[PDB]
Predict the structure.
Amino acid sequence: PVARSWVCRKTYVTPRRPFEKSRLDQELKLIGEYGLRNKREVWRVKFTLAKIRKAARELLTLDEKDPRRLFEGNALLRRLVRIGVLDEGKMKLDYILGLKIEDFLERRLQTQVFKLGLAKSIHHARVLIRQRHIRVRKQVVNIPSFIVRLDSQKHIDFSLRSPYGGGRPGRVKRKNAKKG
Amino acid sequence: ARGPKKHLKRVAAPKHWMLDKLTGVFAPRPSTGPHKLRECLPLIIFLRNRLKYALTGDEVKKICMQRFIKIDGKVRTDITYPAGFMDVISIDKTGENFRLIYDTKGRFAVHRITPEEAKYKLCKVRKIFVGTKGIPHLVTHDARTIRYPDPLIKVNDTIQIDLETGKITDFIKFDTGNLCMVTGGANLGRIGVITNRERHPGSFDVVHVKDANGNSFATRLSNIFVIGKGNKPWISLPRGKGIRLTIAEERDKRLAAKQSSG
Amino acid sequence: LLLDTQQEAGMLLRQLANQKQQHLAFRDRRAYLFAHAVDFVPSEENNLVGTLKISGYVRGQTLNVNRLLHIVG
Amino acid sequence: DTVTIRTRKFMTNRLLQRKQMVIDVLHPGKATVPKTEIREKLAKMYKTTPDVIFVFGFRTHFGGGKTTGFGMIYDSLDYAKKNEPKHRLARHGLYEKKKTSRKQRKERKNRMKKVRGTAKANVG
RNA sequence: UACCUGGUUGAUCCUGCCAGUAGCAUAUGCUUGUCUCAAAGAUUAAGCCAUGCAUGUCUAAGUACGCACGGCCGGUACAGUGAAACUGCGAAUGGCUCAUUAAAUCAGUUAUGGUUCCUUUGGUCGCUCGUACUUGGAUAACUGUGGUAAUUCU
RNA sequence: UGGUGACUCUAGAUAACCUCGGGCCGAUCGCACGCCGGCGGCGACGACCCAUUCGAACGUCUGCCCUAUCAACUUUCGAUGGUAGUCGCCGUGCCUACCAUGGUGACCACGGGUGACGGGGAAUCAGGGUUCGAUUCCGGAGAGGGAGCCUGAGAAACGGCUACCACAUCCAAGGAAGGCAGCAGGCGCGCAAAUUACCCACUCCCGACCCGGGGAGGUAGUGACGAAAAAUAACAAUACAGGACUCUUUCGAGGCCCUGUAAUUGGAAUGAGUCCACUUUAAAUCCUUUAACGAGGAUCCAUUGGAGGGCAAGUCUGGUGCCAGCAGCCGCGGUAAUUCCAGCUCCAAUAGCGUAUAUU
RNA sequence: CUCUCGGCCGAAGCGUUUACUUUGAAAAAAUU
């Protein structure tokens, strides 16, 4: 007996049909849109959305005045507004089902970086995040799949330690400036 | 097993202790005492997890051996000594007194008391027998056996005991129209007036209890604990007034709190 | 297994002793010797040919004298 | 200069004769601060001598700004000696651990089990 | 994501299987830059085991005459710390395994008004009308004498 | 007197009894010492019995996988019941005597099997289900095989003893010592599994006991079992190429974005690494934090499978000639091979990807 | 659905008894 936790999930489901042109092409398109490493990122997103839709489904079957349906539903809607996928007016349980994969890929950090004019391309944004140039509030974020919340979005900066941000030039600049 | 067990694992430990899942392999096995190990706080958990005074078991020990902690007006040096319901914990160096009373949710709340109130505790009688030359004995839920009590006192009644003497003072009889708390089961920690008790021979007697907010619920008689004559309690009551909040209303409360303090 | 201490080398010796032996097929069906000590008694020194005295342990099978003997090189 | 000490969850243990606290350290440019410096800083904050305070468990956050540790400021040095875990007293040279390994002393024990009487003191 | 595709024929529609497909488990092949977690001699042999280790323990409080110790002040019975040994307690927990075992174990449920229960916790402990301002005999540790090839032997 | 749903309960009175292998009715210690010559305050060990806790141990009810190529089974030696007893901590065929002739069974008894410890659970799944659960929590069982004990509150204990069987070490030939299904490690077995590492710093447990001890446990090491995150480049100027907006009958001409080739350049940005220090920590390591060095493609070079159909991707080139081979299946090969071995090219998955097996 | 004892009410019986449904108290944590 040890003091260790063996709890862990798989965070994606591999598709049933491995080769269908519609699917492959679609996922490729998605990838190209939001600058992702492989199919598995897309699949992760798909899995999460699927989970959400399951949750929403298993609530609608209960009575309108059933407490569980109310409370849990309200929580779920809150969670989906707090990330910035749904809208405050469309905060009813049925609207959850009409969500798309891309609407969750839009709230990824990379995409935010791209949109906010900190980067020039999606790949460029990704790289900027990876190299530790992008911070959120004050915390430096290395992970690009970091889902940006609605309230936290209004301050995504360039991190004081980076060359683009505060100052102190990088390595290449140091090397070139110390030639003669 | 060949004999009695001396160990308890953290996973098998009772939930209302609010222990972790990763700090160690073993929970602190409560020493045999006045309370059943399922429904009690060991002194260690209360001292280091609730109050945070100590950080480790060693630190806890270093307090218990310096003889600062008094449970029911008596110095206990054992770190695993079980303090249960209605139990008075006194630290004199800080000048702080706590009584173990169940929270609304079913856990042991850190409930601070006045030094005036800390002089007495309440006891549910478990059994009354007459033994040796016509001497009747009460036996309370805290294993405290009191010789020569009031002949009016019957089973399932609550008595007030002054801790300095160890003698009974005055009692509340179990009757419809008395304020109660639950000591075990689903409704644990909930407070209300007794509505109606129904008897079942050869089984547990189901007792109905009405809330302050009109929420009627039921329990077993072994789990009920009388407190108040009519409506007003004989002891202080936790910050949550014993009325169990539903989830939605709790959420609402939380939201309100968030709003108010920014 | 690392060799640094005499304690480490003792662990190695122990490992070499209790080991699953790979039985090499050629060795097992014949009978062989390693030389521990070699002595030479020439019949005639001018001939430069004499009697050899190879002393060591028989390892393969039961060594029969009627059979020939081959020295490796 | 650019180092800043803030004190979070602060509590006085009168049953232990100490001042228990959480410490946030801001050091935006530099590395993690050596413990001595932080001890000094805390001393200068709380008016007391640096000799009596102990700090432990400093984990710097990802990115490189905040560092969060636990620190306790005892009343007297004697009280500190009497209450603190002995390895934290060894970091200030107040305690010395025996240089023997576990294995050796196990072996010795097992040897001395075998012989009776005064001969337990001879075998080592 | 309540999903099917190839294969019986000159061609067709069927029954029907075989094959594909996706997981999840053990093994294994090739390959492997970083980082957070993380199973791991179960399966076959509940087969055998070199060596080392895993249960020991003292307070103001049972017994100190080991100069073993610096040390009191000296007729100061016992200043103190204290190896040992007697005593008390622990070793019936933990850890390991899954061989046996099929209403057996086990689970939920009930009983003990049919029993025992270290310790803790509470009660009780001049309720008996009949040398004590202190009882006896040993035995360790210690000294010394030994035996046996050898043992945690005596 | 008092109490339960109910006592042959507790409590009361009377007559007695009370084991010598005997039941309680303190021949014990520590701390401060103080009061009318005599009295005392805290605490430690105790102690018959009550309670209590930790339990245990016996019962009740209902709930298991396969098999009829197991249909009758159980009773002479207890089978089912009655009475009396013995034993047992207690209730009982638990045992003994004496009686009766029962009890179970197609609602599957009994017998046999199980690649059967039981649960909590896991995997898969629309709904229903099917399969797994040796594995860290609870319960059970056994320490080579069986059997019997001592001490103890508690054991039919095995890091106790006593035997016999099976193994097996040292022997001076007389005897002595065994028990890793504890933690390492070894052999053997196999398709199949880690270091004779450091530490009681945590979690806890045991102990006369704040102090001692603990291969319980923690920490490292091995670790592609498995799960989470996530690099292997980004950008600008050029030279083309598209797709657009404005102007021209159209050709066209412009300043509008996007795309690769760049056998073109260009500087910036970084981690892998290398490596002071700090931190972490029982002591370390790792991570995190940070000085310096660290990136131009012959590198700091990405792999495994496949490319007729199923099934995403070549009637490309060379070799082979029903040979070698491939191919889950359908089939490919007998001289133009889209299927073999290569080269080139492309596709799928991507730090993973094949293959065999159990299973959904 | 009701006569008996107590403070219009609580005890006393129920009602042929189930099966069924709903509710109530219990059903260890971890996992889910």
In short: Residues 18-180 of chain A form one domain. Chain A has seven helices and two strands.
